[PDB]
Coordinates of C-alpha atoms and ligand atoms in Angstrom, one line a residue:
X1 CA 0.0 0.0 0.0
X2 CA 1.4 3.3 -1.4
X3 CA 0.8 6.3 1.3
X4 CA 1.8 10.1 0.2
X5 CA 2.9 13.0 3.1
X6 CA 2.9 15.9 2.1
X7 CA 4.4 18.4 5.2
X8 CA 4.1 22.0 5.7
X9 CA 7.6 23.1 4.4
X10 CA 9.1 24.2 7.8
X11 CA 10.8 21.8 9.7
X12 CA 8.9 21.4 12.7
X13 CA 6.1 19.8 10.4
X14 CA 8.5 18.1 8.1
X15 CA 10.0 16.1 10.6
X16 CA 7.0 14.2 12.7
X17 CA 5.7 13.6 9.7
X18 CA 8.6 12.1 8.8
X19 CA 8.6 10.3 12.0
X20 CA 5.6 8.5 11.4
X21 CA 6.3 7.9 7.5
X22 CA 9.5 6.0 9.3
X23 CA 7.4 3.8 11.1
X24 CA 4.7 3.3 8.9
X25 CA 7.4 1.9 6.4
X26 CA 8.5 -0.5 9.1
X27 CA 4.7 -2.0 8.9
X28 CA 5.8 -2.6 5.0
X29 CA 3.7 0.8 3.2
X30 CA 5.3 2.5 0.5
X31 CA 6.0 6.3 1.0
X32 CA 6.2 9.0 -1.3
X33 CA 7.2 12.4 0.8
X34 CA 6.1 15.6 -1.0
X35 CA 8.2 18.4 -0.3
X36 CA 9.1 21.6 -1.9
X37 CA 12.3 22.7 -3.6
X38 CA 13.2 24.8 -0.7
X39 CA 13.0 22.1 1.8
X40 CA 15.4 19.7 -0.6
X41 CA 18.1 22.1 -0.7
X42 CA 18.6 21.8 2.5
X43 CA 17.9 17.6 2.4
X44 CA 21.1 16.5 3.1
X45 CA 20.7 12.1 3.7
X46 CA 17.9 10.1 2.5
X47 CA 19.0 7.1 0.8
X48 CA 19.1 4.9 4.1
X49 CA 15.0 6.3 4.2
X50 CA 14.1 4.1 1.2
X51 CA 11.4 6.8 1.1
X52 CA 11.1 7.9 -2.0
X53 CA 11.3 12.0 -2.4
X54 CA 9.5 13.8 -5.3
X55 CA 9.4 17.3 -5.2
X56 CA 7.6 20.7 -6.3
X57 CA 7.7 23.6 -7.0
X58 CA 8.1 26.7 -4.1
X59 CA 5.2 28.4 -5.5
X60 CA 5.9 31.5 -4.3
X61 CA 9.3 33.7 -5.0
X62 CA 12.5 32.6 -4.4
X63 CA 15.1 34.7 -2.0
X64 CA 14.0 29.6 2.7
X65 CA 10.6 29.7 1.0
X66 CA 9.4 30.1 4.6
X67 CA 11.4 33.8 5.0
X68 CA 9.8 34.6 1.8
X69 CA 6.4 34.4 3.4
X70 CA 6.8 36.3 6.1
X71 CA 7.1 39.1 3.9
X72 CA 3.7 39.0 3.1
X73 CA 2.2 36.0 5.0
X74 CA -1.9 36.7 3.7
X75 CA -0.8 37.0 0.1
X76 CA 2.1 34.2 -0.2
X77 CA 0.7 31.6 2.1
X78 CA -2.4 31.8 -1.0
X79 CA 0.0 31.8 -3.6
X80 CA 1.7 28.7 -1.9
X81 CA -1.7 27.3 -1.3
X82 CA -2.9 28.1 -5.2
X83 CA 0.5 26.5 -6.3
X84 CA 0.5 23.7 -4.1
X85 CA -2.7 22.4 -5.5
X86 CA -1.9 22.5 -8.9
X87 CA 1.2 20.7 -8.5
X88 CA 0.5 18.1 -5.9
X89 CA -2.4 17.4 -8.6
X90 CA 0.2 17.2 -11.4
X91 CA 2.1 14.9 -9.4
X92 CA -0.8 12.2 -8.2
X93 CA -1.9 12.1 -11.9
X94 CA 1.7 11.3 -12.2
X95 CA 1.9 8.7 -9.8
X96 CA -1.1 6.8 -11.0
X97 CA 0.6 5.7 -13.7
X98 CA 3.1 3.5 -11.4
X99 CA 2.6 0.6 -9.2
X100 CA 2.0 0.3 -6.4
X101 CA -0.9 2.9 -7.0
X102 CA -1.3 6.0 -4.0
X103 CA -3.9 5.0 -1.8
X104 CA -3.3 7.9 1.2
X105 CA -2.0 11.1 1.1
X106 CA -1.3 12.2 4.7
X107 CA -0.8 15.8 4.7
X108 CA 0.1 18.6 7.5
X109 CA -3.4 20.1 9.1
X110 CA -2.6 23.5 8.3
X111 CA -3.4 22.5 4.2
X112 CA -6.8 21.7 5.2
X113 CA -7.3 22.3 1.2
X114 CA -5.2 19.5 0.5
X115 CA -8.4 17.3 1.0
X116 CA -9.9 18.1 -1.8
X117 CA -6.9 17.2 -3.7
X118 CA -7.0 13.7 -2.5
X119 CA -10.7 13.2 -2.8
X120 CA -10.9 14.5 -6.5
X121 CA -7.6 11.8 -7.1
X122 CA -9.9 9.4 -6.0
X123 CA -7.4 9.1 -2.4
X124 CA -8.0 9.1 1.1
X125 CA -7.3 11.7 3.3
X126 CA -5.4 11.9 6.5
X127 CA -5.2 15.5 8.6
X128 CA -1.8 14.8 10.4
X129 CA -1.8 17.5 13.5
X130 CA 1.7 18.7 14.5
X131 CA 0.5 20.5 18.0
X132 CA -1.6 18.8 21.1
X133 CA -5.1 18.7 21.3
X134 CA -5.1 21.2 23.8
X135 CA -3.7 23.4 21.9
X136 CA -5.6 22.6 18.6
X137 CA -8.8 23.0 20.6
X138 CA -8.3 27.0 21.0
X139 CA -7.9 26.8 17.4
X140 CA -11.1 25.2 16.8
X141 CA -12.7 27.6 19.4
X142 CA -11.5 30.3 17.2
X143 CA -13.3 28.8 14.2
X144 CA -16.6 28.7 16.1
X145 CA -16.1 32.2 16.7
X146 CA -16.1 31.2 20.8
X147 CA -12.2 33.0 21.2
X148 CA -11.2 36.0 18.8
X149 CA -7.1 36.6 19.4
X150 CA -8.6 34.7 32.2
X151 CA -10.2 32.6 29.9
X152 CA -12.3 29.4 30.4
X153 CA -12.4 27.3 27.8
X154 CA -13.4 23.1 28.1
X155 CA -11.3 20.6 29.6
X156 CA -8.5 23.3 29.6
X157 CA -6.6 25.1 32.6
X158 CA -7.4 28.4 33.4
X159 CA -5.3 29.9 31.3
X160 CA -4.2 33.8 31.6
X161 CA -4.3 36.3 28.3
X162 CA -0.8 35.5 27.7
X163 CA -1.0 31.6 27.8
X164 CA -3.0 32.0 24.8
X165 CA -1.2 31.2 21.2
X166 CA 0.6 34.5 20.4
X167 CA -0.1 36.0 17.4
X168 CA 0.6 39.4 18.1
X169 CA 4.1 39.4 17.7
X170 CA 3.7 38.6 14.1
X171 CA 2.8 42.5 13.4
X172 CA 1.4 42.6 9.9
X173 CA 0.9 38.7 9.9
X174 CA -1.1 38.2 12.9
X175 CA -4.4 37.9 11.2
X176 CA -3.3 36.0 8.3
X177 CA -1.4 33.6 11.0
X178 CA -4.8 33.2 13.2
X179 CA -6.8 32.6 9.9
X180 CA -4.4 29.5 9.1
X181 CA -4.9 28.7 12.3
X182 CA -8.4 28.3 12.8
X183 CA -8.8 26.9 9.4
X184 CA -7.5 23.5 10.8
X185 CA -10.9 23.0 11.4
X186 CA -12.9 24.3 8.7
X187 CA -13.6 20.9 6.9
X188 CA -12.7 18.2 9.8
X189 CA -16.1 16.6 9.2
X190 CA -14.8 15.1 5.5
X191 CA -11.6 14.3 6.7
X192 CA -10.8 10.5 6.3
X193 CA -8.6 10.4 9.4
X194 CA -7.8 12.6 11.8
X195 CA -4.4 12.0 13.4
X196 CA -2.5 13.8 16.1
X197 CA 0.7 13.5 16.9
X198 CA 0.2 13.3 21.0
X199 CA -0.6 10.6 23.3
X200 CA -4.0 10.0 25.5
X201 CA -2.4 9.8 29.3
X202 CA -1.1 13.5 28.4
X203 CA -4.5 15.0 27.6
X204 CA -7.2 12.9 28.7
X205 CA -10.3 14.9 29.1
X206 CA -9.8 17.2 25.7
X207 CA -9.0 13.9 23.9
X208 CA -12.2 12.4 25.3
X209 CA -14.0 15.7 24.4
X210 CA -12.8 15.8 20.8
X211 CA -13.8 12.1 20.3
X212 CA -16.8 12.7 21.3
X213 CA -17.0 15.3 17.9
X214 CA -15.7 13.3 15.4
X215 CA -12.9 9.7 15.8
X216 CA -9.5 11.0 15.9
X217 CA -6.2 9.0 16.4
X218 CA -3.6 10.0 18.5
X219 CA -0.7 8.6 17.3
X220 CA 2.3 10.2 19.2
X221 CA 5.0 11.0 19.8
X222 CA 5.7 9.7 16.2
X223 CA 9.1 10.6 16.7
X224 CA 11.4 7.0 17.6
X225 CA 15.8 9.8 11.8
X226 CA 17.1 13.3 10.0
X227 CA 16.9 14.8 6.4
X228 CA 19.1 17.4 7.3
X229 CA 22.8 17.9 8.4
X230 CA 22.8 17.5 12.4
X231 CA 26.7 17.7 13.0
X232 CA 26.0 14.3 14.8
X233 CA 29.5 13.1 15.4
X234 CA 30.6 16.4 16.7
X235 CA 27.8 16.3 19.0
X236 CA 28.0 13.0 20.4
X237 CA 31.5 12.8 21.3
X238 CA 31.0 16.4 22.9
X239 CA 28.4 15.1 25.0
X240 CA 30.2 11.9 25.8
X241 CA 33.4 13.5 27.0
X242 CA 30.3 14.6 30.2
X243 CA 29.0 13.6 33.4
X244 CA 25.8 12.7 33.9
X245 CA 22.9 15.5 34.4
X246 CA 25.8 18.2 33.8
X247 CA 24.5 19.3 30.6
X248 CA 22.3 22.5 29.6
X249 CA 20.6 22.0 26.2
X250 CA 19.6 25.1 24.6
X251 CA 17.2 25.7 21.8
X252 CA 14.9 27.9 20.0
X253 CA 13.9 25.8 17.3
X254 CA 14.1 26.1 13.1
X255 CA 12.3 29.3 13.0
X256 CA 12.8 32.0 16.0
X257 CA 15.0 34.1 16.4
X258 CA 16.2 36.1 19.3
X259 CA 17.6 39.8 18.9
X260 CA 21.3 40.3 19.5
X261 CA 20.4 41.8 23.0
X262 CA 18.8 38.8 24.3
X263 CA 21.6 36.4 22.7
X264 CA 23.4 38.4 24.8
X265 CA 21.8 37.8 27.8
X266 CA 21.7 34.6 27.0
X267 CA 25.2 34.1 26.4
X268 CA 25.9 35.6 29.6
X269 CA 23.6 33.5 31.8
X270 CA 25.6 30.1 29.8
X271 CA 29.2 31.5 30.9
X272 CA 28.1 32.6 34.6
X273 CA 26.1 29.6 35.6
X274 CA 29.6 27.8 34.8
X275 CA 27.0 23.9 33.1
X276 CA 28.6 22.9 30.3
X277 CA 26.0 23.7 27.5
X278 CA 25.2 22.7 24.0
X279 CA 23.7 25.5 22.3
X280 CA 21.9 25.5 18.8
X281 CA 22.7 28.6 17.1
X282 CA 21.6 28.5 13.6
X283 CA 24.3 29.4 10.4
X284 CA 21.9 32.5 9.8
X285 CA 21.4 33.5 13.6
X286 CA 25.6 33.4 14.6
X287 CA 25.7 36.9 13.2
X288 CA 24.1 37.9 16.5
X289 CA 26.8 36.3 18.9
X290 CA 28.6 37.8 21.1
X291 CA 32.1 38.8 19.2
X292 CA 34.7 35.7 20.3
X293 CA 31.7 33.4 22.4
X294 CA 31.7 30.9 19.5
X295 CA 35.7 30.8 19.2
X296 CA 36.8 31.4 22.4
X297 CA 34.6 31.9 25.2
X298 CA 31.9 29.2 25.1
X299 CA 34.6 27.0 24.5
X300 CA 35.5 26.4 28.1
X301 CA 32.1 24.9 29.2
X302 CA 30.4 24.7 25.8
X303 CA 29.6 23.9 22.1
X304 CA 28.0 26.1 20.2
X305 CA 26.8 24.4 16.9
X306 CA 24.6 25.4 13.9
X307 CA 22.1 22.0 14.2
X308 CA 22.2 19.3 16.2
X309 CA 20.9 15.3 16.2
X310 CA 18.3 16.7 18.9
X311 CA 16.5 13.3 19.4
X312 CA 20.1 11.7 20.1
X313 CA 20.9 14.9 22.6
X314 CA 17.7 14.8 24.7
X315 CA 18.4 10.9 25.1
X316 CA 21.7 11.5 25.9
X317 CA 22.4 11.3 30.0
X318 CA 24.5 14.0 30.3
X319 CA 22.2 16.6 29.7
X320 CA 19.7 17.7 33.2
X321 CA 17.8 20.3 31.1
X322 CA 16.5 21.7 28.3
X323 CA 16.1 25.7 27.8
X324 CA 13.6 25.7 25.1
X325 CA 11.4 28.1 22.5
X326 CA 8.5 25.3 23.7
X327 CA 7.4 24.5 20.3
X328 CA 5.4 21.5 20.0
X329 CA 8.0 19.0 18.6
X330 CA 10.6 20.2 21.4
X331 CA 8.1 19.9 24.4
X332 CA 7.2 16.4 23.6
X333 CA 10.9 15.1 22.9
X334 CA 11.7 16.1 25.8
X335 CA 9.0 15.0 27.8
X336 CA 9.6 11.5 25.8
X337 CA 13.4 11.6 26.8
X338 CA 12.8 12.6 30.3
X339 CA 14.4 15.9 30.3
X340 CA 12.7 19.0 32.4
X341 CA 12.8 22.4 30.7
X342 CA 13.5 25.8 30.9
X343 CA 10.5 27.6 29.1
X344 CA 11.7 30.7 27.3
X345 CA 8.2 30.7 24.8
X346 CA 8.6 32.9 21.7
X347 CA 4.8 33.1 20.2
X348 CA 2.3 31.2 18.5
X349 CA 1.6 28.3 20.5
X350 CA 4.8 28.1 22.6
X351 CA 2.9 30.4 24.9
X352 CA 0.3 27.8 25.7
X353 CA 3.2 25.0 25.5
X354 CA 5.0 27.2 28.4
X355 CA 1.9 26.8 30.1
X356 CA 0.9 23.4 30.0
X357 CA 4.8 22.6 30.7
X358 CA 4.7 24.5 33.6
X359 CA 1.4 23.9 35.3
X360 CA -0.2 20.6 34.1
X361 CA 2.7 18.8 33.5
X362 CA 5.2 20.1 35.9
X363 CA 8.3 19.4 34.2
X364 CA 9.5 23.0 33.9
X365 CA 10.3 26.3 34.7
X366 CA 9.1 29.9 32.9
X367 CA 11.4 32.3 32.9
X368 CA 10.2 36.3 33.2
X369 CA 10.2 38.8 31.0
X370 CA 11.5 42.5 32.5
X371 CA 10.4 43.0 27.1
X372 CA 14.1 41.6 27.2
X373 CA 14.6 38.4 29.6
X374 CA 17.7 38.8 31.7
X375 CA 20.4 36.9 32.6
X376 CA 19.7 36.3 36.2
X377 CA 16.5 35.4 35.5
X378 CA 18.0 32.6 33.4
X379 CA 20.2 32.2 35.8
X380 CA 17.7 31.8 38.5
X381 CA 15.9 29.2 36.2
X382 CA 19.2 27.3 35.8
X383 CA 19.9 27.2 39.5
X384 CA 16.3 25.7 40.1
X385 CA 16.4 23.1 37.7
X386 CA 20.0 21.8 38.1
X387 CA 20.2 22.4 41.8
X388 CA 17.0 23.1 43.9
X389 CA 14.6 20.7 45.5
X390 CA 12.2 21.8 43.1
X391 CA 14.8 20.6 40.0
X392 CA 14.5 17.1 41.5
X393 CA 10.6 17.2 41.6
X394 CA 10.5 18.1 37.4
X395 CA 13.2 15.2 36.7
X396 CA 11.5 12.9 38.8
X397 CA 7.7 14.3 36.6
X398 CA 9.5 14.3 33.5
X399 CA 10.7 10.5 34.1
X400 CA 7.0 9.5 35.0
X401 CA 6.1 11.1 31.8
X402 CA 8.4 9.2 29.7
X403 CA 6.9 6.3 31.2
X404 CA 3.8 6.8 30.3
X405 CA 5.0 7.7 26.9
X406 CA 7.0 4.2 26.4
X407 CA 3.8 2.5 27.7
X408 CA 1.9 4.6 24.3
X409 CA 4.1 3.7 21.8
X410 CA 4.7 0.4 23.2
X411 CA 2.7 -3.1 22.1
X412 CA -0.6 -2.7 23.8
X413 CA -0.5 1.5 24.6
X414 CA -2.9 4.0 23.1
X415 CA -0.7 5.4 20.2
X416 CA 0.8 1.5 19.2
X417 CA -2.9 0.6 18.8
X418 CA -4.1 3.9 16.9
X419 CA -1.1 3.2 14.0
X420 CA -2.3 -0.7 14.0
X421 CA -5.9 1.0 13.5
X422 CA -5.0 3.1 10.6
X423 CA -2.6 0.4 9.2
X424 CA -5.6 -2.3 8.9
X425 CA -7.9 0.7 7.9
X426 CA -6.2 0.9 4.7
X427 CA -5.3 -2.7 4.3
Ligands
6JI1 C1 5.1 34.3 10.8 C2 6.3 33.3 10.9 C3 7.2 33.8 12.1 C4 8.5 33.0 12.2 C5 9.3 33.1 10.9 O1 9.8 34.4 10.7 C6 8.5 32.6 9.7 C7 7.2 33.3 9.6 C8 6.3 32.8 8.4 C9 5.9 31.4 8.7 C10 5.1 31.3 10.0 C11 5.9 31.9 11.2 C12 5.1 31.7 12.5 C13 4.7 30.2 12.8 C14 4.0 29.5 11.6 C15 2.6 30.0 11.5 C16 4.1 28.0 11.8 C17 2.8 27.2 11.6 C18 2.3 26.9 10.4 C19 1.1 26.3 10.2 C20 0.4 25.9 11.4 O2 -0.7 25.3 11.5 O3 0.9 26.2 12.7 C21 2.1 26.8 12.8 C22 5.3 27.5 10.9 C23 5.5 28.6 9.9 O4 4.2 29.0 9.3 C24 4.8 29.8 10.4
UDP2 O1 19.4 21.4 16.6 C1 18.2 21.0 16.3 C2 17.1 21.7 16.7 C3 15.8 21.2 16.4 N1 15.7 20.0 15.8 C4 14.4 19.5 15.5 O2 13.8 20.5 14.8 C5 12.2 20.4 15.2 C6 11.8 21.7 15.9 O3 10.4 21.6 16.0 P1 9.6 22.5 17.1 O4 8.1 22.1 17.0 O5 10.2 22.2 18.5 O6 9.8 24.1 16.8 P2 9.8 24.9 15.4 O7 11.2 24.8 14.8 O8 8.7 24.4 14.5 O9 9.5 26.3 15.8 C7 12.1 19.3 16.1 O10 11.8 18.1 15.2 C8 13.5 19.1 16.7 O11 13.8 17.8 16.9 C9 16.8 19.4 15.5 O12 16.7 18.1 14.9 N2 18.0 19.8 15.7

C-alpha cells in the first residue's frame, strides 16, 4: 500500500511527519514524501529512508521559502496554497501511472485544502496535526467564533491572556497567522482520518472531548531519523566527554529568532552559571553572537553548533535540562526523553506550551520577561532546575512522563494501537 505525506515546508512539520512515514514503512507501506524545492536544498541524507522524495515547486518567490512568506504571509501563504494544489495534482496524476498505486496522502493540518486534492484523485485523506489537542482546541474555538485573538475554555486550565497562542508578535501577519490557524478545522467533518501527533495519558479529558465530535487518532510521539545535516559526530563525542545531568541544552527551534540583545543575555547566563551547554545557534542566527563566544569563550564549558541530532541529545544522559522556545516538537521530545525544561516561549503556541509545561505537566520552569529576559533570571531558572529541591521534583515528573510515553508507543498503549488502527484501515 502506497501512502503520500505531504508536510508543511518548515521543519517542525517536516520532521513528525517524517517520523511516522519512518514507522509506517517498518509496517511494509510504500511512502512518497512531498516536499518543496526549498526544503530539498537543505535535504542533506535520504537514501538509508528508502522513502522515495518527489518534489515541487516553491510556488511562491525565491530569495527559505518560509522567510519569503513572512514578507507577506496573507498574500504568499495563497499563492503557496494556489500552487500547491496544482502541483500536488500534477504529481498524483503522475503517480497513477506506477505501481503500487497511491492509496493515502497524509498531509500537515494547516493545508486543510489538500483534502480536496486527494478526494478529487480518487485518495484518502489523512489531517496529520503537528500541535496537542489542547492546543488545537483553542484553534477550533477560534473557528466557532467562541475565542477571537482569564479565559475558560473546556477541559482546559485556566489559562491567563498571555498563555493563549501569540499571534501578536507577528505585526502585519497576525491575522493572516490566526486565519491559518483556525482553518485547521474548517472541513474536519470530511476528513478520512484525523491524526494527532500526542498521546492520551497527556490530555485525557480534551482527547475524550474531541472524540466525542468526530474519531480521531492520537498517534504520538511519532518521533522513535534526519533529512538534514545534524553535526552528529561532533555532538556526540562532545556530550560523551560529560557527566551525567551536567549538561544544559539550549534551543529555539528552526524558525525563531532572538535579537542580538537577548543572545546576549543569553550568552551571559551560559558563561556565569559555569554547566557545560550545548547551544543551537543556527548558520543565519551566529551573526548575533557575542564577538569571540563561539571561538573562544563558550569553548571552556560549551559547544555552540549550527544544528544538532536533537532526538540523540535529549536521550543522551549528560544533559539535566532543556532551555527551550517550547514549540510542540521540542516539548514532547523532551518529555519523551525525560528531560525538564526551561521555558523561554517565543509566540504562536509556545505560549500555551510554556503553560501546559509549567502547570499541568510540571516538568519545567518559565522564565520572566523584564520586554528583554535577563540573565539572572536565566540564571535563577538554571539554578532551580539543576540544583533546587524543586529541579529534582521536574526530573523525577518528566521520568513519570516518559513512562507513560514508552507504555503509548509500546505493544498494547494508546498510540501503538491507533497506527495498528490506521494500518488495517487501509489494508
Ligand atoms: C510568521 C512566521 C514567524 C517566524 C518566521 O519568521 C516565519 C514566519 C512565516 C511562517 C510562519 C511563522 C510563525 C509560525 C508559523 C505560523 C508555523 C505554523 C504553520 C502552520 C500551522 O498550522 O501552525 C504553525 C510555521 C510557519 O508558518 C509559520
Ligand atoms: O538542533 C536541532 C534543533 C531542532 N531540531 C528538530 O527540529 C524540530 C523543531 O520543531 P519544534 O516544534 O520544536 O519548533 P519549530 O522549529 O517548529 O519552531 C524538532 O523536530 C527538533 O527535533 C533538530 O533536529 N536539531
Amino acid at each position: 500500500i502506497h501512502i503520500l505525506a505531504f508536510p508543511f515546508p518548515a521543519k517542525g512539520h517536516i520532521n513528525p511527519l517524517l517520523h511516522l512515514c519512518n514507522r509506517l514503512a517498518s509496517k511494509g507501506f510504500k511512502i512518497t514524501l512531498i516536499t518543496t524545492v526549498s526544503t530539498l536544498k537543505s535535504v542533506k541524507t535520504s537514501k538509508a529512508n528508502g522513502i522515495d522524495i518527489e518534489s515541487i515547486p516553491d510556488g511562491i518567490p525565491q530569495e527559505q521559502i518560509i522567510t519569503v512568506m513572512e514578507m507577506n504571509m496573507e498574500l504568499y501563504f495563497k499563492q503557496f496554497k494556489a500552487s500547491a494544489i496544482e502541483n500536488t495534482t500534477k504529481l498524483i496524476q503522475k503517480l497513477k501511472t506506477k505501481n503500487p498505486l497511491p492509496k493515502v496522502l497524509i498531509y500537515d493540518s494547516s493545508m486543510p485544502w489538500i483534502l480536496e486534492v486527494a478526494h478529487e484523485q480518487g485518495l484518502l485523506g489523512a489531517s496529520f496535526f503537528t500541535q496537542p489537542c489542547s492546543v488545537s482546541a483553542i484553534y477550533y474555538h477560534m473557528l466557532q467564533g467562541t475565542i477571537k485573538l482569564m479565559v475558560s475554555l473546556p477541559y482546559l486550565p485556566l489559562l491567563e491572556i498571555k498563555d493563549l497562542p501569540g499571534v501578536q508578535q507577528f505585526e502585519d501577519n497576525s491575522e493572516a497567522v490566526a486565519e491559518l490557524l483556525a482553518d485547521q478545522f474548517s472541513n474536519i467533518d470530511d476528513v478520512d482520518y484525523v491524526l494527532f501527533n500526542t498521546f492520551d495519558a497527556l490530555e485525557i479529558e480534551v482527547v475524550n472531548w474531541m472524540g466525542s465530535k468526530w474519531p480521531i487518532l492520537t498517534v504520538g510521539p511519532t518521533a522513535p531519523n534526519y533529512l538534514f545535516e545534524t553535526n552528529t559526530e561532533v555532538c556526540m563525542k562532545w556530550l560523551d566527554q560529560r557527566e551525567i545531568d551536567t549538561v544544559i541544552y539550549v534551543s529555539f527551534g528552526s524558525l525563531a529568532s532572538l535579537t542580538e540583545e537577548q543572545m546576549e543575555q543569553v550568552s551571559q547566563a551560559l558563561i556565569r552559571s559555569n554547566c557545560y551547554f550545548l547551544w543551537v545557534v543556527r548558520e543565519e542566527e551566529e551573526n548575533k553572537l557575542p564577538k569571540d563566544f563561539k571561538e573562544t569563550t563558550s569553548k571552556k564549558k560549551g559547544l555552540v553548533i549550527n544544528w544538532c541530532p536533537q532526538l540523540d541529545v535529549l536521550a543522551h544522559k549528560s544533559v539535566a535540562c532543556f532551555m527551550t522556545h517550547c514549540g510542540w516538537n521540542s516539548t514532547l521530545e523532551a518529555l519523551c526523553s525525560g528531560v525538564p525544561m526551561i521555558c523561554m516561549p517565543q509566540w504562536a503556541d509556545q505560549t500555551t506550551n510554556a503553560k501546559l509545561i509549567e502547570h499541568v505537566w510540571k516538568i519545567g520552569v518559565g522564565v520572566n520577561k523584564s520586554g528583554i529576559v535577563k540573565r539572572e533570571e536565566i540564571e535563577d531558572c538554571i539554578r532551580q532546575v539543576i540544583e533546587s529541591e524543586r529541579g529534582k521534583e521536574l526530573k523525577r515528573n518528566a521520568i513519570k512522563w516518559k513512562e507513560l510515553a514508552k507504555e503509548a508507543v509500546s505493544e498494547g498503549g494508546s498510540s501503538c494501537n491507533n497506527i495498528q488502527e490506521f494500518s488495517s484501515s487501509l489494508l
